Amino acid sequence: DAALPSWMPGADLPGYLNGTLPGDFGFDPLYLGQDPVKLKWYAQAELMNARFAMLAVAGILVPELLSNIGFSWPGAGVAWYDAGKFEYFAPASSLFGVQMLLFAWVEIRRYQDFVKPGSANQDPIFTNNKLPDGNEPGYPGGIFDPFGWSKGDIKSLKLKEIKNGRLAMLAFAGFIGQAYTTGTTPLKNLSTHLADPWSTTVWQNDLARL
Amino acid sequence: VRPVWFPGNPPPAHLDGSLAGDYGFDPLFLGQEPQTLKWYVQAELVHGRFAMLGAAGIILTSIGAKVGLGFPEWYDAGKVVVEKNNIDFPTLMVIQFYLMGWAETKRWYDFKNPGSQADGSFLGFTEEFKGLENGYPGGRFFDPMGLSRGDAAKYQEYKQKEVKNGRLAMIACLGFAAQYAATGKGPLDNLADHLADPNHVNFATNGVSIPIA
Amino acid sequence: SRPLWLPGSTPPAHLKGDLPGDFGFDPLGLGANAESLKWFKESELVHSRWAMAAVAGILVQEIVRPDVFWYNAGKEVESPLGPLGLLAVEFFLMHWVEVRRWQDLRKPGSVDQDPIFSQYKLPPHEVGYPGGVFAPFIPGDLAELKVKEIKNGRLAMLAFVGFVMAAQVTGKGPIAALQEHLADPWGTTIFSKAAVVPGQAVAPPCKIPASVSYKGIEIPTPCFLQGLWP
Amino acid sequence: RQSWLPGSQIPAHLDTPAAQALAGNFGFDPLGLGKDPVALRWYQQAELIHCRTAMAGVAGILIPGLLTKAGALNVPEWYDAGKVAIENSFAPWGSLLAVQLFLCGFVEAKRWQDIRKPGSQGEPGSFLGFEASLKGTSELGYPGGPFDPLGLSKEADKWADWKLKEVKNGRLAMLAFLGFVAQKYATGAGPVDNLAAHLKDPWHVNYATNGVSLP
Ligand code: CLA
Ligand code: CLA
Ligand code: CLA
Numbered sequence: 001d002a003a004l005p006s007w008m009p010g011a012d013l014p015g016y017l018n019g020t021l022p023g024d025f026g027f028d029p030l031y032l033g034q035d036p037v038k039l040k041w042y043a044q045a046e047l048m049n050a051r052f053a054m055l056a057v058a059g060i061l062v063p064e065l066l067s068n069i070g071f072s073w074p075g076a077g078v079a080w081y082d083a084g085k086f087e088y089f090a091p092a093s094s095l096f097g098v099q100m101l102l103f104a105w106v107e108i109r110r111y112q113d114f115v116k117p118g119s120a121n122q123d124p125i126f127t128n129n130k131l132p133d134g135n136e137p138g139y140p141g142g143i144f145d146p147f148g149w150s151k152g153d154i155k156s157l158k159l160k161e162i163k164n165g166r167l168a169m170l171a172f173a174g175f176i177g178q179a180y181t182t183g184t185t186p187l188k189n190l191s192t193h194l195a196d197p198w199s200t201t202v203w204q205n206d207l208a209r210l
Numbered sequence: 211v212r213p214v215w216f217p218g219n220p221p222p223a224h225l226d227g228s229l230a231g232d233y234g235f236d237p238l239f240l241g242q243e244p245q246t247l248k249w250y251v252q253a254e255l256v257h258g259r260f261a262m263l264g265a266a267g268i269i270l271t272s273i274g275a276k277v278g279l280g281f282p283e284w285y286d287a288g289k290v291v292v293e294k295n296n297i298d299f300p301t302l303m304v305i306q307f308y309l310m311g312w313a314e315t316k317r318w319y320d321f322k323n324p325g326s327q328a329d330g331s332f333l334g335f336t337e338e339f340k341g342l343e344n345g346y347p348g349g350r351f352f353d354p355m356g357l358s359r360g361d362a363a364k365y366q367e368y369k370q371k372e373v374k375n376g377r378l379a380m381i382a383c384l385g386f387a388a389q390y391a392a393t394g395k396g397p398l399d400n401l402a403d404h405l406a407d408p409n410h411v412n413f414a415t416n417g418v419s420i421p422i423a
Numbered sequence: 424s425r426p427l428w429l430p431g432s433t434p435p436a437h438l439k440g441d442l443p444g445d446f447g448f449d450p451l452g453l454g455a456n457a458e459s460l461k462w463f464k465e466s467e468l469v470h471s472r473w474a475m476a477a478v479a480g481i482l483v484q485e486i487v488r489p490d491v492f493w494y495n496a497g498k499e500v501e502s503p504l505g506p507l508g509l510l511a512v513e514f515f516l517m518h519w520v521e522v523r524r525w526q527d528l529r530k531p532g533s534v535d536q537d538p539i540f541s542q543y544k545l546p547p548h549e550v551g552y553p554g555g556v557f558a559p560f561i562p563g564d565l566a567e568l569k570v571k572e573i574k575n576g577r578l579a580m581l582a583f584v585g586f587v588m589a590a591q592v593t594g595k596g597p598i599a600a601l602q603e604h605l606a607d608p609w610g611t612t613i614f615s616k617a618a619v620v621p622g623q624a625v626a627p628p629c630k631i632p633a634s635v636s637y638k639g640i641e642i643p644t645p646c647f648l649q650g651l652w653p
Numbered sequence: 654r655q656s657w658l659p660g661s662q663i664p665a666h667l668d669t670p671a672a673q674a675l676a677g678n679f680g681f682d683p684l685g686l687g688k689d690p691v692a693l694r695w696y697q698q699a700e701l702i703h704c705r706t707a708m709a710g711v712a713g714i715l716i717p718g719l720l721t722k723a724g725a726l727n728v729p730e731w732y733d734a735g736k737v738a739i740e741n742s743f744a745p746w747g748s749l750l751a752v753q754l755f756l757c758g759f760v761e762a763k764r765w766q767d768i769r770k771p772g773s774q775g776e777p778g779s780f781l782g783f784e785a786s787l788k789g790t791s792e793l794g795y796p797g798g799p800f801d802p803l804g805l806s807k808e809a810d811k812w813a814d815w816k817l818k819e820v821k822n823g824r825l826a827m828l829a830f831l832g833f834v835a836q837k838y839a840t841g842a843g844p845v846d847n848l849a850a851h852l853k854d855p856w857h858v859n860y861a862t863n864g865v866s867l868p
């Protein structure tokens with residue numbers, strides 16, 4: 001409720017979105033985050049759903065971008081929905097058993113940081129290595145920042161992270177429906193929308209399917 | 211002093227002139243309680259409100275018929291639209307009870323508690339369902355022209371013009387059924403028969419209306 | 424003292440000649456609520472400007488293209504950019520423009536800045552009258568033009584309805600309807616084409632088809648209040 | 654506050670501070686069944702346990718039902734799943750229900766006495782050292798301790814949320830099971846099958862097109 005940037009310029013504000021959180025514009029019309037015990041949860045819930053989406057959209061497009069150019073991979077050109085049935089050195093059950101133990105470390109390490117910040121930065125077996133104090137949940141730093149960034153202008157970099165993140169969550173939610181309706185690779189849906197942009201919107205592909 | 215339904219006879223004691231369309235017509239003293247009369251003022255409006263919608267609905271679909279259009283008559287519009295559009299009939303009527311039984315109990319707890327329904331209990335809308343007086347909610351949605359505020363001298367005139375058109379709409383929708391059960395045809399077919407020969411094509415010459423034919 | 428819609432009358436109490444084009448004509452009491460007067464003062468100007476652009480749209484199209492008829496010309500243009508790609512652009516490019524206009528109605532000091540070229544800014548104008556970029560080289564007095572906008576505007580709103588109701592009765596464009604009236608005035612009126620006596624109702628038929636094909640699914644083309652015509 | 658009907662007078666036995674301190678208090682008692690305070694306290698314990706058994710029950714019906722219509726399971730319909738899984742089994746149903754009512758009856762009769770006197774089972778010497786953790790909390794129906802492994806109880810704020818989230822997912826599940834029984838009598842198909850039938854044709858396939866909303 002100030003001269004902050006807004007999603008609808010001139011609209012009234014909820015009042016609790018003053019600007020401490022990374023990249024806010026007041027967009028909460030369902031009034032979901034009024035309770036700060038829910039807003040503190042939803043802020044970290046936004047970052048994790050964002051960062052895994054930036055991994056996802058770069059993990060779908062780039063193996064398709066460098067395959068429709070045409071490289072030589074053991075998995076090349078295979079669709080992101082068709083990567084589950086694809087075989088590897090092991091069946092996918094055992095792979096999922098490794099994930100649910102390595103992430104059961106990391107997520108519980110990350111959740112212990114959320115319930116008390118400043119009390120997770122110590123290794124178990126290497127008791128000299130630690131992340132430097134003063135960090136907030138969602139931004140650990142230290143070895144997580146190996147290139148030496150975030151030593152100045154952290155607010156705009158958090159704003160870039162949440163804006164490059166929110167575009168990715170829309171893009172992966174793009175990837176779900178736009179590969180479920182037409183059933184193609186969502187890099188190749190761009191090919192039809194660039195072949196004839198006026199003869200395939202979402203509407204005409206809906207109406208031809210309907 | 212005011213015009214009454216029957217000249218000479220005074221209005222009853224419970225019926226001073228403040229309501230719209232008040233003409234002292236309560237011979238059975240049915241509004242003798244000042245709180246059931248608060249209910250019947252609600253009742254005369256919503257009967258007149260539906261009948262004004264109804265009598266316009268019979269007439270406008272009968273204007274289109276007999277000119278040459280493909281319209282049904284109002285007694286046959288019920289069958290022809292659950293048959294043309296393949297609309298299952300119980301699932302049409304049940305949704306009519308869901309949408310209106312929603313909209314009716316809001317009224318039924320406006321009468322019990324006029325200050326209520328304005329606590330943000332709905333989706334956030336507070337003073338739209340505040341209700342101005344009995345049978346006249348107003349606010350943003352029910353009066354989007356904003357005619358119930360500004361000048362209130364012309365609003366009392368519109369209150370009377372609603373009840374006057376509302377009375378004879380109820381008489382019309384009592385007459386459309388009566389013109390159909392007696393004759394057996396549409397309403398503007400009965401009008402055009404009365405305009406063909408005004409003598410002998412009235413109600414007296416059916417043998418259904420007077421049994422002394 | 425001001426001119427009125429009916430010179431012997433008096434204007435109602437909610438119309439005091441403040442607004443442009445205020446000739447005191449509101450018999451149905453609609454200008455009583457001052458919250459809703461601003462909504463109507465906006466919506467008269469919007470209805471006028473589209474209708475001025477539409478009537479000059481049909482008149483220019485009729486004097487350069489006697490081939491096609493404007494009521495049918497939404498069907499036959501054969502754009503290469505698709506039937507729904509046009510509607511998709513027009514949907515998004517108007518859901519931007521109108522919502523900017525709507526937020527100007529709600530909070531007038533809220534929409535003044537070019538959001539992507541923030542060095543540029545609209546002046547703090549009057550509601551419904553943006554100016555600045557939308558108004559260069561204004562000729563003469565501004566309030567004179569403000570009445571000239573609505574008088575030509577109200578004339579054009581009645582003109583477009585006159586175009587549509589001529590296009591459903593004689594089915595030809597509004598110079599072809601004018602050439603029917605100028606070749607034969609005594610027989611080419613609506614009182615000549617129709618009359619209702621108490622006992623029969625003679626109305627003209629449509630010069631409009633009930634439906635059109637238009638590339639697959641059919642589109643219903645109804646004559647606006649057929650049956651209720653005189 | 655936030656009544657089930659916004660115009661109603663809430664009955665006075667839901668507006669006392671020992672009743673407005675309660676989850677799911679939407680002013681709904683049109684029979685006046687809980688006007689007596691211990692009868693409210695007893696029916697409050699009946700609602701928590703009718704709803705938690707229903708939430709566990711409905712998640713034992715549609716979660717193996719949705720994960721069967723989507724593949725990767727072969728669990729049959731819930732109204733026929735009692736007939737099967739007794740042949741992939743070892744006892745008769747009589748020999749299985751009696752051990753059930755022994756195992757469930759030892760639990761329920763301890764919850765019975767803890768309702769009658771809170772902190773009943775916390776007295777020393779009941780169990781073999783395990784009776785210490787069985788005093789419940791300061792309010793009954795929410796035991797905690799060994800019934801809270803993740804430790805969500807010790808907040809004192811966000812706590813009325815977890816109460817009211819339990820009751821509302823609980824009351825929805827009780828209507829879901831009263832659903833499941835009724836949408837098995839009326840049409841004989843599965844509940845996900847009835848959801849598939851309503852999605853492919855909403856405007857003709859419902860309870861207006863069977864013989865149970867009969868005029
Ligand atoms: C992340 C943004 C994004 C982008 C760039 C696209 C792009 C595309 N989608 Mg898609 N989509 C998205 C999100 C997105 N989608 C989401 C979130 C959903 C789920 C609701 C879908 C569901 C979807 C379906 C079901 C279909 C497409 C189709 C298409 C293609 C035709 C264009 C069209 O009809 O627009 C579709 C536009 C929308 C669905 C509206 C989404 C609007 C987004 C969320 C906001 C706009 C983002 C940004 C401001 C503008 C883009 C610029 C930015 C990339 C730099 C096109 C390649 C069609 C296709 O494949 O035909 C070739 C099709 O059938 N999409
Ligand atoms: C639809 C029902 C209905 C209802 C509830 C009311 C209600 C009211 N009218 Mg009203 N009125 C109606 C229809 C109705 N009117 C119609 C159609 C006309 C035109 C004839 C009038 C003409 C009228 C005048 C002129 C006056 C009122 C007045 C009143 C008020 C006091 C009288 C009273 O207690 O009503 C009690 C009403 C009922 C209990 C409902 C009537 C139902 C009866 C019991 C059934 C039988 C009626 C009739 C014999 C059957 C004819 C059809 C039959 C052949 C099938 C009250 C607000 C007076 C007033 O204060 O004005 C505001 C007044 O002066 N009314
Ligand atoms: C709203 C007013 C209205 C109007 C304009 C018409 C018009 C018409 N009706 Mg009709 N009618 C009406 C109401 C109306 N009706 C009502 C309410 C009934 C039920 C009693 C009837 C019953 C009826 C029959 C049975 C027939 C007509 C017919 C006709 C047509 C020929 C005229 C005729 O025979 O007179 C009929 C005139 C009347 C019945 C009286 C007019 C309305 C009076 C004033 C009732 C108003 C109520 C009164 C003021 C208070 C009631 C007192 C009570 C509360 C104690 C004509 C088009 C005939 C037809 O089809 O022509 C071919 C025919 O056969 N009407």
Ligand code: CLA
Pocket residue numbers: 471472473475476479483548551552553554555557558559560561562565568569570571572575576
């Ligand atoms: C004849 C009608 C007419 C008149 C007198 C005005 C007058 C005015 N308008 Mg307005 N306007 C009109 C039509 C008109 N407008 C239409 C149709 C639109 C919609 C496009 C607008 C949109 C509009 C906006 C958005 C704004 C104004 C503003 C103004 C004010 C200052 C600008 C000015 O000097 O305009 C003088 C106008 C003329 C001298 C009319 C010249 C007409 C010539 C002869 C060409 C007409 C024929 C030609 C075929 C039209 C097609 C053009 C194009 C579509 C190809 C003034 C009160 C501004 C304002 O009030 O802000 C302070 C403002 O911001 N108007």
Ligand SMILES: CC(/C=C/C=C(C)/C=C/[C@@]12O[C@]1(C)C[C@@H](O)CC2(C)C)=C\C=C\C=C(C)\C=C\C=C(C)\C=C\[C@@]12O[C@]1(C)C[C@@H](O)CC2(C)C
Pocket residue numbers: 681682683684685686703704706707709710711712713714730731732734735826827828830831
């Ligand atoms: C417990 C329950 C269901 C539990 C179900 C279970 C465990 C199911 C188990 C199984 O499915 C699985 C898992 C697997 C299957 O293979 C086997 C079985 C065994 C079949 C439902 C409760 C269901 C409880 C219900 C439906 C209660 C509804 C009560 C209502 C609506 C009462 C309202 C009122 O009483 C108030 C509140 C106040 C009064 O004033 C007014 C009125 C209106 C009277």
